[PDB]
Design a protein around this ligand. Structure first.
Ligand SMILES: *Cc1c(COP(=O)(O)O)cnc(C)c1O
Ligand SMILES: *Cc1c(COP(=O)(O)O)cnc(C)c1O
Ligand code: NA
Ligand code: NA
Ligand code: NA
Ligand code: NA
Lengths: 429, 429
């Protein structure tokens, strides 16, 4: 990449949640290997972000590469309507086995947002074929489920700018955000804003949808698994369906294969993505029980009414099988247990930092929340200079590294974080 | 693929728009090269579907493969927020150059539906920034724009089952389906429902959104370019935004690179996809003008509120560049013009077939509408037997093959179609 390349980027190319009029700098990445990213100027950053949850195996993993190139040689894409193929089968084969028993019907899709639209749509079609008028969704505050309209309607109203879509956006129910903390004391009084919400719309709710244990893009919070136990039971008695978005938490990122395992519960609907394909390309997965599967298919339409052009993309499915294959090894269990300890350990000094509100860790997830928003460009510049890639946001500086990160690598990350939160230099307001 | 594999699929794996209790047959493809698809039994089908538009360069293209493998060797993926890279930059470099001048700001996404959800959100955010109260969308009936909630909102209310989502889905404005046909008489009465819809909602409409010239999966209809020119003026004189969905018509499918060229008009917002990457994997793109792009960033949000996890996916971006590179050769124009010739000639017998309502051709789009719904399972089975892959839908049998297709290959497609609409056998009265 050249001087004129980088100038084309700023003037024409949108980035996630970015201004065209005032964009802040970006760093030119030409390649990536192991737990590192390589900038065009040859610098190597240790990766602290896993490209946002996804790249749990690092980059240029050889297993991943070979599976990818072999599938391309057979065909990297062929339509799924209505053709089938070996990658798709073996992917839905794994997915069903590794998830709770009742989850055995699988809808592959292209992104996390699309899959959340699919769960959502499954819930409405389920109640419409049952003769029940249930169009409402119930979710926690601070939740994040995607950027598409439907999923936007289940995101934190304030975090997101729902005032922006005041009028277009359909109005749902948001219970207070889970106060009791993962590995903390369960306070009964936590269950009232929810209790009353179910009470007054109990007749109306088509589904409850939350991020299990970890609320990701809504603030990296980590609530008490006791919450999900309470959630499974009310849904069970109410009949209303439980949607688990494990698109961020999925595939043992939290120290357990799926996050619902923290409360030994299973959802009625499970959304997966991101880490699904080991951070190689976009793929998504929505699983459900056969009873939902059939009650939707025996309805008015005769079918579940969804089906994107690139459904079941063999290439993606191949990356996915390669990734689940790495996991099946089980070696991830100790990688994460080890990363957890070193995260909990080396982030500990941080709570004594004047700028730090809270430090919480679960699995390969280390969160250090400040009392003021980071100075993005400033901080972002200071991380690179340290040889590390860490994408901070609002009041959060956090780590979520490849499972394969070497202790000395984790160490630099954790050292950059402490370093960065002890001076008021990289903060505003 | 083995016997229980195919059985696992039928019982656990969903397909586009399919029933889990009573799914219809499917065909197992093991690989694919050029313009043919190969079944597990070694059977070889000529592809007339281009895997639903996308595979304009056929399958296993050598340029396509090596670009993919090369990018795979540098990195198949790295987060774009906010990092940049060579595959993304060069893609948007090609995008901006090849589309009408005012279109120079690009937002990369993962699928068509998502691209449409971006176009809509740009439109709403645009009017929030100007203090104007415009939340409504104007669009033609018989249109198709995606399967996600927001895009669902502008799909044909009947074709799509809008009763199923009565309420949740926002209720938009629907002009009648465009009566005058591509290459025919422009009849002024055509513009009365539309005029009157705008007349009473002139003030409310944030945007007009339609498929340019060809109405895709909602009918395989072909309207008269005069509709696009007239629409550009009303939009302009009202100031309202115009969104063209070229996820299906884009990259020369109709005889011109982009279908708005038939009317020598430019949208304010353009959606792209499917053929973007040569149908290798999913990638999307939403371009807009610098006035829209700046009016939104200078709004309350401080950025365009979108950013998918895999935004700017280096792997996909790599595939697209090669596919666009192939087009740069310019061969597509006379390859497509020629395919247009053949469809016109050999689809001609169809109008003497009892079962055929209409026969229309535009570019390498051959359409044969029947008088009754096809017998999907039956029809689908007969084509396979013919050595061809044709995927019929509702009352339509249509062909849309790769630009590379051999005259001898095309011949078979069109001859299978002709056979198939003589008797009443493959149809369900
Ligand atoms: C990342 C995420 C999503 C979004 O998926 P996209 O690929 O960005 O569309 C949805 N839900 C949760 C919980 C996520 O972490
Ligand atoms: C195919 C298509 C879409 C949908 O894109 P997906 O990848 O299937 O979500 C949207 N609009 C038009 C005009 C299309 O042809
Ligand atoms: Na299971
Ligand atoms: Na059915
Ligand atoms: Na342009
Ligand atoms: Na701004």
């Amino acid at each position: 990449m050249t001087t004129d390349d980088l100038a084309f980027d700023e003037r024409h190319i949108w980035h996630p949640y970015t201004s065209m009029t005032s964009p802040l700098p970006v760093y030119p990445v030409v390649s990536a290997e192991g737990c590192e990213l390589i900038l065009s100027d040859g610098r190597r950053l240790v990766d602290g972000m896993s490209s946002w949850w996804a790249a749990i195996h690092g980059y240029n993993h050889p297993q991943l590469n070979a599976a990818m190139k072999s599938q391309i040689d057979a065909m990297s894409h062929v339509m799924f309507g209505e053709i089938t193929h070996a990658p798709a089968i073996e992917l839905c084969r794994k997915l069903v086995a590794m998830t709770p028993q009742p989850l055995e019907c699988v809808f592959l899709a292209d992104s996390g947002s699309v899959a959340v639209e699919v769960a959502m749509k499954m819930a409405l079609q389920y109640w419409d074929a049952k003769g029940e008028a249930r169009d409402r969704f119930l979710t926690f505050r601070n939740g994040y489920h995607g950027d598409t309209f439907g999923a936007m309607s289940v995101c934190d109203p304030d975090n997101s700018m729902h005032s922006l879509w005041k009028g277009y956006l359909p109005e749902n129910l948001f219970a207070p955000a889970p106060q009791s903390r993962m590995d903390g004391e369960w306070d009964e009084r936590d269950m009232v804003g929810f209790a009353r919400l179910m009470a007054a719309h109990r007749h109306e709710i088509a589904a409850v949808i939350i991020e299990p244990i970890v609320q990701g893009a809504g603030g990296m919070r980590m609530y008490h698994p006791e919450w999900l136990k309470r959630i499974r039971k009310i849904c069970d008695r109410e009949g209303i369906l439980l949607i688990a978005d494990e698109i961020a938490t999925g595939f043992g990122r939290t120290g357990k294969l799926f996050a619902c395992e923290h409360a030994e519960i299973a959802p009625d609907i499970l959304c997966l993505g991101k880490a699904l394909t080991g951070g190689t390309m976009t793929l998504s997965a929505t699983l459900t029980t056969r009873e939902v599967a059939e009650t939707i298919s025996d309805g008015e339409a005769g079918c579940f009414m969804h089906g994107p052009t690139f459904m079941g993309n063999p290439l993606a499915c191949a990356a996915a099988n390669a990734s689940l294959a790495i996991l099946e090894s089980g070696d991830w269990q100790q990688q994460v247990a080890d990363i957890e300890v070193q995260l909990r350990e080396q982030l500990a000094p941080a709570r004594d930092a004047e700028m730090v509100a809270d430090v919480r860790v679960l699995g390969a997830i280390g969160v250090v929340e400040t009392t003021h928003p980071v100075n993005m460009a400033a901080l972002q510049k200071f991380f690179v200079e340290q040889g590390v890639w860490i994408r901070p946001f609002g009041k959060l500086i956090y780590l979520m590294p490849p499972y394969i990160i070497l202790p000395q690598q984790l160490q630099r990350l954790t050292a950059a974080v402490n370093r960065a939160v002890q001076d008021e230099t990289f903060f505003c307001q």
